[PDB]
Amino acid sequence: NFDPRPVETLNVIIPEKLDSFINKFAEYTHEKWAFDKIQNNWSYGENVDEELKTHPMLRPYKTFSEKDKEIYRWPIKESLKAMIAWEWTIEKAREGEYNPQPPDLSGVTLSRELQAMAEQLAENYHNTWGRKKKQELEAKGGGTHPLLVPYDTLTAKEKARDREKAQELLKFLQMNGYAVTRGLKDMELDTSSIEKRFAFGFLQQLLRWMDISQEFIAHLEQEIKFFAKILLPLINQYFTNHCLYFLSTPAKVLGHASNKEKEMITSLFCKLAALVRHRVSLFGTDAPAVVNCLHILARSLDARTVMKSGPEIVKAGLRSFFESASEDIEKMVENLRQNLTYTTVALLPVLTTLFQHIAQHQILDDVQVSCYRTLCSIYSLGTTKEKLRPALGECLARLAAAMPVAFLEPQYTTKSPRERAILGLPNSVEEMCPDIPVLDRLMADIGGLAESGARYTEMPHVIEITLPMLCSYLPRWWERGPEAPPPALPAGAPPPCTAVTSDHLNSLLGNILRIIVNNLGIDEATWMKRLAVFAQPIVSRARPELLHSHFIPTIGRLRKRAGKVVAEEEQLRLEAKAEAEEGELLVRDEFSVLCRDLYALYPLLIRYVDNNRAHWLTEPNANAEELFRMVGEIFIYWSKSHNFKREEQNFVVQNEINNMSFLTA
Amino acid sequence: LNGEVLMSDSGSETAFREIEIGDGFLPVCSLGPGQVGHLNLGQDVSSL
């Protein structure tokens, strides 16, 4: 593969100046060798050996033969000739024809460019020496090749010999003004912050192949499938494993990632959105792969700061994509009650995108008007009719939690001048949203609806959109309330826009308790489970004064129901029969339904059990006795039925859940 | 730490995997430089 160019070495004629220079070099080498011999006291002898340390060499070289002079005539001249023949970088130095101390050179830092040039020179010397060695082995016939050692992992002998040669060259090139350096690079950008890691080049090249693939999207009227199958799992596992180094800016690492990483991530999101659109049925074979890649990107959507240094660029594309999504949502909500498959069975990853990422403290007018438009579109003729509701609830909770100001009542602070000076929606809340009332009216309506205590039925268009929204809304602004103690002076200094107090939390707890106790277990009821899952910290600011009314009726009803079902089961079964077996399996199904409802309802009551246990440790009351009686009754009822345990184990197996929500943490 | 068992990564009452007795056990406390600690071994109800 590698074919070097053999430059002539013996065909040239040595000039008189070169002959004088090589004669002077040979004389200097002989003088230095004589000085070393007289310093180390190498005496004469009648024979050459090692045990007597005898070597007669202090004689003039003019009386020697050509064979002995040839081994020392060109000790370093071959390398210089190769350098002057191969590399055409001949410098122009000259035209043709009392005890000072050495300075300190290791104190100052070493330049990256100089080190790179020295490493390149060493690599060139090693490669060329290996080339002479291979040529000599071929000339001699061949045989073993013990020199096949990588340069990065060279042996100690070579790693000492090359350093000795380099330091000898440095100490011999000090005079006569000799310095060779061929390079032009900067270490402040190529190996400092951005181009030092290989991630930037990887992102640029994957962008290049993505654009190349996009260049012929309208070609169906081979290569793309193989390219996708190669890249998508690889980039997915790269995001899955290597994700901590791109968490934030390198100044706050541990997480080294500049705005280039965020720009590449946004470009990848735009490219995958484009591939999703246009043709959908053509790329239906890789649809699960696309969904998995979107999920991975959403779970790794760091979304670093871009507008601080880059003038948006991708912000317009994101706005256009969000507008297209809102228009598509309006189209479905209009025509329901090419992108049909994506808008039906693939909008859940979109509504789930960055849902859990932007949830802490860690937010714009455009996002606010977009979520307002989507809410108005959904609420317009959204009844009757898709298995698209948990994703909508998650998107609503994410949009509510990530709000610069209050999005429920006008009591904006950071509004834009275009809302009043340009043609747009008014800055008010009640006028802009015709179906979202003020916070007080909304909570009054919710309390009135909860006070009714109606049955479950189905009604999958009011409770599952209202209860999760308020349940994710109130705790978010509970710490920013005008009455709650703020952790900073600036938070209390600005006029607050929200108004949440303990009465709202008490009403929330009462409504949740009423909706749990109203849901009788006769069939599958996933609405309560979804509500419990979507709002875990609903007891973070509980008010422990109405604990008797919360728990004593509920535990009494639970014990009564358990007693009556176990008594009915015993009465119907007694012996073993086909009718007895049918009754037993019906009771097992009822037990499974009750156990599923209990699995939904545990986290809140368990957190409250921890809380009031702590309160009783601080100050007890008259509740531990009846609590213990209820616990004993329910556990002896559970223990007195092996079929109940078998059904519970079967339901746990068929649930395929890790039950990691109990530990919280 | 404060009225609550310290939770581990696994999520259960993690121990040191059934330490063999050998000779016995003894309470040992440590202290770094520039640190102030209070060792309350417990001699009365008011101590706890």
Side-chain angles (χ1 to χ4, degrees), chain A residues 1-49 51-61 63-160 162-183 189-190 192-197 199-209 211-214 216-220 222-224 226-228 230-244 246-251 254-259 265-281 283-293 295-298 300 302-303 305-311 313-322 324-326 328-330 332-333 335-336 338-362 365 367-372 374-384 390-393 395-398 400-402 404 406 408-414 416-417 419-421 424-426 428-430 433-439 442-457 459-468 470-488 490-503 505-510 512-513 515-517 520-522 524-526 529 531-537 539-540 542-556 558-559 561-567 569 572 574-576 578 580 583-585 587-588 590-596 598-600 602-606 608-612 614-618 620-622 624-629 631-659 661 663-665, chain B:
Chain A
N1 213 13
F2 300 121
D3 289 328
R5 175 67 142 87
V7 293
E8 65 183 1
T9 46
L10 73 165
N11 200 30
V12 298
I13 313 168
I14 311 296
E16 205 56 53
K17 185 174 70 68
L18 201 54
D19 177 44
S20 70
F21 281 167
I22 195 167
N23 267 308
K24 287 297 278 190
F25 173 61
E27 267 182 347
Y28 288 155
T29 312
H30 166 71
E31 266 167 338
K32 295 288 106 174
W33 209 250
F35 285 148
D36 217 0
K37 285 310 159 196
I38 199 167
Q39 156 71 30
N40 288 319
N41 296 299
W42 290 88
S43 65
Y44 283 95
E46 320 173 349
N47 60 313
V48 174
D49 46 348
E51 60 177 1
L52 267 72
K53 301 179 85 176
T54 61
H55 212 181
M57 294 182 286
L58 272 296
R59 59 189 66 230
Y61 65 99
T63 176
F64 269 103
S65 166
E66 298 291 324
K67 38 184 186 77
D68 195 63
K69 213 175 66 66
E70 206 71 34
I71 195 167
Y72 297 137
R73 197 56 155 151
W74 281 23
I76 208 162
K77 270 298 188 300
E78 275 279 346
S79 293
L80 202 79
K81 260 192 65 63
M83 183 177 176
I84 201 167
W86 177 51
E87 208 172 0
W88 306 274
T89 47
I90 295 97
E91 60 195 12
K92 272 188 192 162
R94 287 301 173 271
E95 317 305 295
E97 279 96 2
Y98 286 118
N99 273 357
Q101 44 178 2
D104 268 350
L105 278 76
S106 301
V108 72
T109 186
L110 179 60
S111 314
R112 276 287 184 262
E113 285 312 302
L114 183 62
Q115 192 194 270
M117 291 325 88
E119 182 66 27
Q120 208 68 258
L121 209 66
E123 197 180 358
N124 290 313
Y125 280 163
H126 283 319
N127 170 43
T128 318
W129 282 322
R131 283 208 320 252
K132 277 76 70 177
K133 280 305 285 288
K134 182 259 292 179
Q135 191 42 251
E136 282 299 284
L137 283 173
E138 282 183 355
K140 84 179 289 294
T144 76
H145 58 87
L147 200 64
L148 201 54
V149 179
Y151 309 109
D152 211 356
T153 52
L154 283 173
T155 45
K157 289 295 178 285
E158 278 304 310
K159 274 305 198 195
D162 70 335
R163 286 311 168 190
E164 215 276 331
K165 287 299 177 283
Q167 66 89 30
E168 189 71 34
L169 201 59
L170 198 72
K171 78 178 319 181
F172 198 66
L173 284 186
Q174 191 43 65
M175 64 184 73
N176 213 5
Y178 208 93
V180 174
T181 290
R182 180 55 160 160
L189 192 60
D190 200 75
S192 164
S193 162
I194 302 182
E195 318 291 326
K196 196 254 169 182
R197 287 278 94 199
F200 188 78
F202 293 7
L203 289 160
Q204 294 295 105
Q205 66 184 357
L206 62 85
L207 279 162
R208 277 178 201 110
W209 285 289
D211 294 331
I212 284 300
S213 82
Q214 272 182 355
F216 57 102
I217 48 173
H219 82 291
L220 193 59
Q222 185 61 256
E223 170 65 43
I224 185 65
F226 201 54
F227 155 77
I230 287 185
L231 271 296
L232 268 72
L234 201 53
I235 203 66
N236 275 353
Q237 75 99 27
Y238 185 71
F239 292 166
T240 309
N241 208 3
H242 195 263
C243 55
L244 197 61
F246 306 137
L247 190 143
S248 183
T249 53
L254 278 76
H256 54 88
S258 300
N259 46 354
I265 284 157
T266 51
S267 67
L268 279 163
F269 183 60
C270 185
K271 285 178 318 169
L272 62 84
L275 269 294
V276 168
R277 303 260 183 158
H278 316 321
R279 281 176 176 164
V280 186
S281 48
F283 305 134
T285 76
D286 49 298
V290 167
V291 166
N292 196 13
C293 184
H295 281 167
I296 289 304
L297 189 139
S300 83
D302 287 303
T305 48
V306 190
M307 302 84 87
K308 315 293 166 296
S309 174
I313 300 103
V314 70
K315 195 57 156 42
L318 289 175
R319 291 299 103 196
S320 84
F321 169 68
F322 282 141
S324 74
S326 160
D328 273 337
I329 279 291
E330 201 266 333
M332 320 283 268
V333 72
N335 79 332
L336 267 179
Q338 48 82 22
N339 54 316
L340 193 142
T341 315
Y342 168 65
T343 46
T344 49
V345 292
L347 266 182
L348 283 72
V350 182
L351 291 178
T352 307
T353 309
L354 58 87
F355 156 69
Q356 209 58 58
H357 194 276
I358 300 99
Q360 55 266 17
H361 48 91
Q362 185 253 330
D365 49 348
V367 188
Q368 187 187 4
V369 304
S370 180
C371 67
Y372 285 169
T374 54
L375 271 165
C376 189
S377 175
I378 288 308
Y379 291 162
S380 167
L381 279 176
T383 177
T384 73
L392 189 150
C395 186
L396 174 58
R398 193 264 318 283
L408 207 54
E409 55 178 0
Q411 266 63 44
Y412 323 104
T413 68
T414 57
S416 73
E419 283 183 344
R420 46 192 63 87
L425 75 164
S428 57
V429 182
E430 55 93 20
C433 294
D435 44 352
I436 294 92
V438 76
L439 190 143
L442 202 52
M443 61 79 71
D445 279 319
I446 286 302
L449 194 66
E451 192 273 332
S452 82
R455 299 305 105 84
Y456 177 73
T457 72
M459 76 163 159
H461 200 228
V462 295
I463 49 169
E464 60 96 16
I465 65 160
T466 44
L467 276 298
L470 61 83
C471 274
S472 47
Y473 213 81
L474 293 177
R476 273 301 285 117
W477 281 269
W478 164 251
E479 52 93 18
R480 282 171 297 195
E483 56 91 20
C497 200
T498 185
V500 61
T501 50
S502 82
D503 57 350
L505 300 168
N506 297 348
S507 62
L508 185 146
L509 294 174
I512 293 299
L513 187 138
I515 207 169
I516 298 299
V517 303
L520 192 144
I522 206 64
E524 183 74 27
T526 57
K529 196 145 65 150
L531 182 53
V533 162
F534 269 69
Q536 274 288 140
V539 74
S540 47
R543 205 56 183 167
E545 276 83 3
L546 199 66
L547 55 91
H548 262 277
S549 306
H550 300 117
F551 293 97
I552 307 301
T554 54
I555 65 177
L558 274 169
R559 292 193 311 280
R561 290 177 183 177
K564 64 90 175 179
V565 298
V566 72
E569 187 271 330
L572 66 89
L574 284 177
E575 69 267 13
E584 207 274 316
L585 65 94
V587 168
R588 269 176 88 183
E590 291 209 292
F591 283 172
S592 70
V593 169
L594 263 68
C595 192
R596 195 224 43 85
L598 285 182
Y599 285 165
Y602 290 165
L604 276 297
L605 61 87
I606 292 306
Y608 214 83
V609 162
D610 273 355
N611 288 316
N612 64 7
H615 295 105
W616 303 336
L617 183 63
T618 64
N621 50 18
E625 293 101 5
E626 61 257 25
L627 194 48
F628 291 157
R629 286 140 194 190
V631 169
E633 279 323 289
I634 64 169
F635 291 168
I636 65 177
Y637 285 158
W638 162 62
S639 75
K640 280 311 283 174
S641 280
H642 186 273
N643 53 1
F644 183 41
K645 313 171 172 289
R646 178 161 72 248
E647 187 53 55
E648 187 259 339
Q649 186 48 249
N650 283 350
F651 201 83
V652 162
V653 164
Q654 295 297 109
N655 268 354
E656 296 99 14
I657 53 180
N658 280 356
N659 312 103
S661 67
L663 61 84
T664 72
Chain B
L1 277 296
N2 292 267
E4 48 172 4
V5 58
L6 194 47
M7 212 56 258
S8 62
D9 287 334
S10 87
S12 282
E13 293 296 323
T14 306
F16 296 105
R17 304 309 303 129
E18 60 91 21
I19 301 169
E20 184 64 28
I21 314 301
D23 189 40
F25 293 129
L26 194 144
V28 175
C29 173
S30 165
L31 215 60
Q35 308 296 324
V36 174
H38 172 256
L39 183 63
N40 198 226
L41 189 41
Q43 317 182 251
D44 194 359
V45 54
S46 162
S47 181
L48 320 169

PDB file of all heavy atoms in Angstrom, chain B residues 9-26:
ATOM      1  N   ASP B   9     -29.466   2.595  47.746  1.00  0.00           N
ATOM      2  CA  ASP B   9     -29.796   2.505  46.327  1.00  0.00           C
ATOM      3  C   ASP B   9     -30.743   1.344  46.050  1.00  0.00           C
ATOM      4  O   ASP B   9     -31.646   1.457  45.211  1.00  0.00           O
ATOM      5  CB  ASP B   9     -28.520   2.363  45.498  1.00  0.00           C
ATOM      6  CG  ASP B   9     -27.726   3.651  45.422  1.00  0.00           C
ATOM      7  OD1 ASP B   9     -28.334   4.735  45.551  1.00  0.00           O
ATOM      8  OD2 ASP B   9     -26.495   3.579  45.227  1.00  0.00           O
ATOM      9  N   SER B  10     -30.546   0.216  46.738  1.00  0.00           N
ATOM     10  CA  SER B  10     -31.392  -0.953  46.516  1.00  0.00           C
ATOM     11  C   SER B  10     -32.833  -0.687  46.934  1.00  0.00           C
ATOM     12  O   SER B  10     -33.774  -1.096  46.241  1.00  0.00           O
ATOM     13  CB  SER B  10     -30.830  -2.155  47.271  1.00  0.00           C
ATOM     14  OG  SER B  10     -31.308  -2.186  48.605  1.00  0.00           O
ATOM     15  N   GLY B  11     -33.028  -0.007  48.055  1.00  0.00           N
ATOM     16  CA  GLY B  11     -34.350   0.289  48.552  1.00  0.00           C
ATOM     17  C   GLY B  11     -34.859  -0.615  49.652  1.00  0.00           C
ATOM     18  O   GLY B  11     -36.073  -0.822  49.743  1.00  0.00           O
ATOM     19  N   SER B  12     -33.976  -1.152  50.490  1.00  0.00           N
ATOM     20  CA  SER B  12     -34.378  -1.962  51.633  1.00  0.00           C
ATOM     21  C   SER B  12     -33.415  -1.674  52.780  1.00  0.00           C
ATOM     22  O   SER B  12     -32.505  -0.849  52.661  1.00  0.00           O
ATOM     23  CB  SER B  12     -34.420  -3.448  51.257  1.00  0.00           C
ATOM     24  OG  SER B  12     -35.595  -3.745  50.522  1.00  0.00           O
ATOM     25  N   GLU B  13     -33.610  -2.369  53.902  1.00  0.00           N
ATOM     26  CA  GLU B  13     -32.774  -2.181  55.088  1.00  0.00           C
ATOM     27  C   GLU B  13     -31.411  -2.811  54.820  1.00  0.00           C
ATOM     28  O   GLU B  13     -31.115  -3.943  55.215  1.00  0.00           O
ATOM     29  CB  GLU B  13     -33.441  -2.776  56.322  1.00  0.00           C
ATOM     30  CG  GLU B  13     -34.715  -2.065  56.749  1.00  0.00           C
ATOM     31  CD  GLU B  13     -34.467  -0.630  57.174  1.00  0.00           C
ATOM     32  OE1 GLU B  13     -33.415  -0.365  57.794  1.00  0.00           O
ATOM     33  OE2 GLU B  13     -35.325   0.231  56.891  1.00  0.00           O
ATOM     34  N   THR B  14     -30.568  -2.052  54.128  1.00  0.00           N
ATOM     35  CA  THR B  14     -29.257  -2.545  53.739  1.00  0.00           C
ATOM     36  C   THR B  14     -28.338  -2.654  54.949  1.00  0.00           C
ATOM     37  O   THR B  14     -28.211  -1.717  55.743  1.00  0.00           O
ATOM     38  CB  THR B  14     -28.634  -1.626  52.687  1.00  0.00           C
ATOM     39  OG1 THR B  14     -29.545  -1.466  51.593  1.00  0.00           O
ATOM     40  CG2 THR B  14     -27.331  -2.211  52.167  1.00  0.00           C
ATOM     41  N   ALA B  15     -27.693  -3.811  55.082  1.00  0.00           N
ATOM     42  CA  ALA B  15     -26.741  -4.050  56.159  1.00  0.00           C
ATOM     43  C   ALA B  15     -25.371  -4.355  55.574  1.00  0.00           C
ATOM     44  O   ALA B  15     -25.162  -4.216  54.364  1.00  0.00           O
ATOM     45  CB  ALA B  15     -27.213  -5.194  57.057  1.00  0.00           C
ATOM     46  N   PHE B  16     -24.428  -4.771  56.419  1.00  0.00           N
ATOM     47  CA  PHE B  16     -23.077  -5.096  55.979  1.00  0.00           C
ATOM     48  C   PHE B  16     -22.891  -6.590  55.741  1.00  0.00           C
ATOM     49  O   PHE B  16     -21.793  -7.120  55.948  1.00  0.00           O
ATOM     50  CB  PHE B  16     -22.054  -4.579  56.989  1.00  0.00           C
ATOM     51  CG  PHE B  16     -22.035  -3.083  57.119  1.00  0.00           C
ATOM     52  CD1 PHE B  16     -22.592  -2.462  58.224  1.00  0.00           C
ATOM     53  CD2 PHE B  16     -21.461  -2.297  56.133  1.00  0.00           C
ATOM     54  CE1 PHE B  16     -22.576  -1.085  58.345  1.00  0.00           C
ATOM     55  CE2 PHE B  16     -21.442  -0.919  56.248  1.00  0.00           C
ATOM     56  CZ  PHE B  16     -22.000  -0.313  57.356  1.00  0.00           C
ATOM     57  N   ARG B  17     -23.953  -7.275  55.309  1.00  0.00           N
ATOM     58  CA  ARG B  17     -23.910  -8.675  54.881  1.00  0.00           C
ATOM     59  C   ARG B  17     -23.425  -9.600  55.999  1.00  0.00           C
ATOM     60  O   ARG B  17     -22.367 -10.229  55.906  1.00  0.00           O
ATOM     61  CB  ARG B  17     -23.051  -8.832  53.619  1.00  0.00           C
ATOM     62  CG  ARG B  17     -23.491  -7.962  52.450  1.00  0.00           C
ATOM     63  CD  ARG B  17     -24.976  -8.127  52.161  1.00  0.00           C
ATOM     64  NE  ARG B  17     -25.333  -9.516  51.900  1.00  0.00           N
ATOM     65  CZ  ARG B  17     -26.317 -10.163  52.510  1.00  0.00           C
ATOM     66  NH1 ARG B  17     -27.068  -9.574  53.427  1.00  0.00           N
ATOM     67  NH2 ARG B  17     -26.554 -11.432  52.192  1.00  0.00           N
ATOM     68  N   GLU B  18     -24.235  -9.672  57.062  1.00  0.00           N
ATOM     69  CA  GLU B  18     -24.094 -10.613  58.177  1.00  0.00           C
ATOM     70  C   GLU B  18     -22.662 -10.683  58.714  1.00  0.00           C
ATOM     71  O   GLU B  18     -21.958 -11.680  58.540  1.00  0.00           O
ATOM     72  CB  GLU B  18     -24.698 -11.986  57.783  1.00  0.00           C
ATOM     73  CG  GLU B  18     -24.150 -12.783  56.569  1.00  0.00           C
ATOM     74  CD  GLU B  18     -23.034 -13.762  56.895  1.00  0.00           C
ATOM     75  OE1 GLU B  18     -22.909 -14.164  58.072  1.00  0.00           O
ATOM     76  OE2 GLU B  18     -22.279 -14.128  55.971  1.00  0.00           O
ATOM     77  N   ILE B  19     -22.214  -9.589  59.337  1.00  0.00           N
ATOM     78  CA  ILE B  19     -20.873  -9.537  59.910  1.00  0.00           C
ATOM     79  C   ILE B  19     -20.694 -10.654  60.926  1.00  0.00           C
ATOM     80  O   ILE B  19     -21.484 -10.796  61.867  1.00  0.00           O
ATOM     81  CB  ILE B  19     -20.622  -8.170  60.564  1.00  0.00           C
ATOM     82  CG1 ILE B  19     -20.781  -7.038  59.549  1.00  0.00           C
ATOM     83  CG2 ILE B  19     -19.237  -8.124  61.189  1.00  0.00           C
ATOM     84  CD1 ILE B  19     -20.814  -5.672  60.196  1.00  0.00           C
ATOM     85  N   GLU B  20     -19.651 -11.460  60.736  1.00  0.00           N
ATOM     86  CA  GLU B  20     -19.322 -12.494  61.704  1.00  0.00           C
ATOM     87  C   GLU B  20     -18.822 -11.855  62.996  1.00  0.00           C
ATOM     88  O   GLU B  20     -18.186 -10.797  62.986  1.00  0.00           O
ATOM     89  CB  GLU B  20     -18.270 -13.445  61.127  1.00  0.00           C
ATOM     90  CG  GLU B  20     -17.916 -14.627  62.020  1.00  0.00           C
ATOM     91  CD  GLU B  20     -19.091 -15.563  62.253  1.00  0.00           C
ATOM     92  OE1 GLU B  20     -19.974 -15.647  61.374  1.00  0.00           O
ATOM     93  OE2 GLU B  20     -19.131 -16.212  63.319  1.00  0.00           O
ATOM     94  N   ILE B  21     -19.131 -12.503  64.120  1.00  0.00           N
ATOM     95  CA  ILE B  21     -18.824 -11.923  65.426  1.00  0.00           C
ATOM     96  C   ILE B  21     -17.317 -11.855  65.638  1.00  0.00           C
ATOM     97  O   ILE B  21     -16.742 -10.773  65.806  1.00  0.00           O
ATOM     98  CB  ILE B  21     -19.509 -12.727  66.545  1.00  0.00           C
ATOM     99  CG1 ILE B  21     -20.965 -13.018  66.182  1.00  0.00           C
ATOM    100  CG2 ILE B  21     -19.425 -11.976  67.865  1.00  0.00           C
ATOM    101  CD1 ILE B  21     -21.799 -11.783  65.944  1.00  0.00           C
ATOM    102  N   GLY B  22     -16.656 -13.009  65.633  1.00  0.00           N
ATOM    103  CA  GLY B  22     -15.217 -13.057  65.794  1.00  0.00           C
ATOM    104  C   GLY B  22     -14.774 -12.816  67.222  1.00  0.00           C
ATOM    105  O   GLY B  22     -14.415 -13.758  67.936  1.00  0.00           O
ATOM    106  N   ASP B  23     -14.800 -11.555  67.652  1.00  0.00           N
ATOM    107  CA  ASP B  23     -14.402 -11.205  69.011  1.00  0.00           C
ATOM    108  C   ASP B  23     -15.482 -10.388  69.707  1.00  0.00           C
ATOM    109  O   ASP B  23     -15.710 -10.547  70.910  1.00  0.00           O
ATOM    110  CB  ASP B  23     -13.081 -10.434  68.998  1.00  0.00           C
ATOM    111  CG  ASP B  23     -12.516 -10.227  70.389  1.00  0.00           C
ATOM    112  OD1 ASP B  23     -12.598 -11.164  71.210  1.00  0.00           O
ATOM    113  OD2 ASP B  23     -11.990  -9.126  70.660  1.00  0.00           O
ATOM    114  N   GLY B  24     -16.146  -9.517  68.966  1.00  0.00           N
ATOM    115  CA  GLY B  24     -17.166  -8.657  69.527  1.00  0.00           C
ATOM    116  C   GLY B  24     -17.251  -7.360  68.748  1.00  0.00           C
ATOM    117  O   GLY B  24     -16.626  -7.208  67.703  1.00  0.00           O
ATOM    118  N   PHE B  25     -18.039  -6.431  69.284  1.00  0.00           N
ATOM    119  CA  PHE B  25     -18.265  -5.138  68.657  1.00  0.00           C
ATOM    120  C   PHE B  25     -18.069  -4.029  69.680  1.00  0.00           C
ATOM    121  O   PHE B  25     -18.219  -4.240  70.887  1.00  0.00           O
ATOM    122  CB  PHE B  25     -19.669  -5.048  68.049  1.00  0.00           C
ATOM    123  CG  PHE B  25     -19.879  -5.961  66.878  1.00  0.00           C
ATOM    124  CD1 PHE B  25     -20.972  -6.810  66.830  1.00  0.00           C
ATOM    125  CD2 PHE B  25     -18.980  -5.973  65.825  1.00  0.00           C
ATOM    126  CE1 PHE B  25     -21.165  -7.652  65.753  1.00  0.00           C
ATOM    127  CE2 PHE B  25     -19.168  -6.813  64.745  1.00  0.00           C
ATOM    128  CZ  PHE B  25     -20.262  -7.653  64.709  1.00  0.00           C
ATOM    129  N   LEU B  26     -17.731  -2.838  69.182  1.00  0.00           N
ATOM    130  CA  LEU B  26     -17.425  -1.708  70.036  1.00  0.00           C
ATOM    131  C   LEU B  26     -17.686  -0.417  69.271  1.00  0.00           C
ATOM    132  O   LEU B  26     -17.293  -0.319  68.097  1.00  0.00           O
ATOM    133  CB  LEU B  26     -15.969  -1.762  70.504  1.00  0.00           C
ATOM    134  CG  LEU B  26     -15.522  -0.870  71.662  1.00  0.00           C
ATOM    135  CD1 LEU B  26     -14.497  -1.607  72.497  1.00  0.00           C
ATOM    136  CD2 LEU B  26     -14.937   0.432  71.148  1.00  0.00           C
TER     137      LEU B  26
END
